């Protein structure tokens, strides 16, 4: 008919016990529309391309229509090539990359431009950029290039390659001058240990302005950085005060079906919100496919992934167009993808904390840039 009654959706998850899996299950359980999504979730090491491509080929031979999973720097090119060759959509909440196809929908919005706007707003000219090697170096190139145009002085420090003594020498060189400016671009699960390192042996107060380049400001424990003169400025994508996020979190709290793992609380992460909105865009795209009466059901079992005359299925372009032409309001706000498969037309709440509390200083858009408030 217009659409199959049950639609198989593949999934590549790094581990069984995670908050992202709980968000996936809850978002699947929330939907009650006639297009039902049957999940096939496989636990696969994301740092190995062989295991990931075996799982991808197994799910493709099973007959999935879209795959929701995570990747890394090692498996991004392989996933991009396979999705561009087999015309199979891949929806991911992982870090955005410049080298991608139109079949890869990255739910995580970019941050390499909001950070530059924030640095320009603060009139920073000499600072230390502490970055993570296994997170993508595009933002580091952008920072270095903007420094080249604007004659900045950036001291690039890698987290992996620097020991405690190197950090101590770097921070002594920082306290040699008066204005200590540090921009940290690293993930929360490592930024916690990084901030513990900063607060334990090093010190701050009356200066030491930090700009944390992350999508979640409430996801980290800033009590160690509190009660001091250090100023912390970050970015917030989701905040639980608006009507839709509060309603979603209230439905999550009073859930009749108990969630997996151990807990779903104690500083919930934004990646769970990205997973929730990924399930939501999948559901709305498939319901829009059913609404337009465009045939999606498979006419014959899918063959081997390694067929040399690999022809693309004709419904793949329709699936990609339906997944791309989506605009709804979810946990993270307005969800909308451009022609390149990345999120566009969104907002970030710029939040500053200077030994008083949490204060929103403005917001950044793709058109109005950083507007103060």
């Amino acid at each position, epitope marked *: 008919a217009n659409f199959p009654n049950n639609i198989q959706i593949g999934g590549l998850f790094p581990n069984q016990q995670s908050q992202e899996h709980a968000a996936f299950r809850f978002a699947l359980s929330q939907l009650t529309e006639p297009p039902k999504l049957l999940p096939q979730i496989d636990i696969v090491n994301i740092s190995d391309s062989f295991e990931m491509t075996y799982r991808f080929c197994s799910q493709f031979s099973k007959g999935v229509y879209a795959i929701f999973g995570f990747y890394e720097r090692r498996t991004v090119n392989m996933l991009t090539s396979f999705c561009g060759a087999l015309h199979v959509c891949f929806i991911t909440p992982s870090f955005p990359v410049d080298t991608s196809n139109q079949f890869v929908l990255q739910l995580r919005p970019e941050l390499q431009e909001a950070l530059i706007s924030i640095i320009d707003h603060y009139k920073w000219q000499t600072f230390v950029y502490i970055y993570d090697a296994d997170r993508g170096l595009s933002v580091l190139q952008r920072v270095l290039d903007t420094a080249a145009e604007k004659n900045w002085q950036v001291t690039a420090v890698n987290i992996l390659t620097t020991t405690e003594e190197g950090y101590r020498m770097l921070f002594q060189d920082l306290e040699k001058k008066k204005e200590r400016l540090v921009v940290v671009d690293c993930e929360s699960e490592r930024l916690n240990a990084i901030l513990g390192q900063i607060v334990k042996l090093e010190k701050n107060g009356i200066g030491y302005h930090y700009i944390l380049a992350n999508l979640g400001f409430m996801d980290i424990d800033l009590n160690k950085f509190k009660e001091s003169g250090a100023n912390v400025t970050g970015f917030q994508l989701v905040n639980y005060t608006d009507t839709i996020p509060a309603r979603i979190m*209230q439905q999550w*709290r*009073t859930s009749d079906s*108990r969630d*997996h793992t*151990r*807990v779903d*609380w104690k500083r919930p992460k934004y990646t769970s919100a990205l997973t929730y909105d990924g399930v939501k865009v999948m559901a709305e795209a498939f319901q829009s496919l059913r609404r337009q009466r465009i045939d999606i059901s498979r006419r014959g079992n899918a063959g081997d992934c390694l067929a040399n005359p690999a022809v693309p299925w004709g419904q793949g372009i329709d699936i990609q167009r339906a997944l791309q032409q989506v605009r709804f309001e979810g946990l993270t706000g307005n969800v909308q993808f451009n022609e390149k498969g990345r999120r566009t037309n969104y907002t970030l709440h710029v939040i500053e904390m200077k030994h008083d509390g949490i204060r929103k200083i403005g917001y950044w858009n793709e058109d109005d840039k950083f507007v103060p408030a």
Partner: single-chain antibody
Amino acid sequence: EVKLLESGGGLVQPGGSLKLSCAASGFDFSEYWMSWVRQAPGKGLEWIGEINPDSSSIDYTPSLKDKIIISRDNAKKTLYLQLSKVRSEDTALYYCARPRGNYVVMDYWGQGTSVTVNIVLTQSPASLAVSLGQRATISCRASESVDSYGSSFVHWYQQKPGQPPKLLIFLASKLESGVPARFSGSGSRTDFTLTIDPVEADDAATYYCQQTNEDPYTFGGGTKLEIKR
């Protein structure tokens, strides 16, 4: 660990409305929803009422829904339950408890008091008595599944007569916070088991196994534990 204060237990007139003051000190009901449970003397506990953290919609007991009404304020963190046509059997020990799903430390029930106006399981041995420092194991057989939605959905509450009950083991993966009890669920656990080692005088209480897998959370007969001298 949140604090719960419940005092004012006393007899009332025939059919007069009674109210219990349950104060959430050190926290608020918005973080964890407050639920009232009524337990008869020498019998398992029953869910008297479940409320919401945002104070939007509240529930009642599955046995007597319209007979009792509970109103709670999260900002004031105060809950009061009232009823009509109170009988001799209706005067049971009512205690308020915060939601245990938020954290292990959040599973702190109120003091509870008595007045004079589900889950099916069997815990063995019923009569247990060991010296201090010994290891005690109690097996709680149940007719339902040993684990709901993958992980375990059972818990053990160490209640005493006239004292606030405490949950030691919950879901076989998170023990009691603040004071880590040596007894916790482990393994596949077809029957709920918790190896207490070493034992202590302060660790002598009635352990009742309540399964959250079967709706609703009702305390079973449990097993009695003391300190043999």
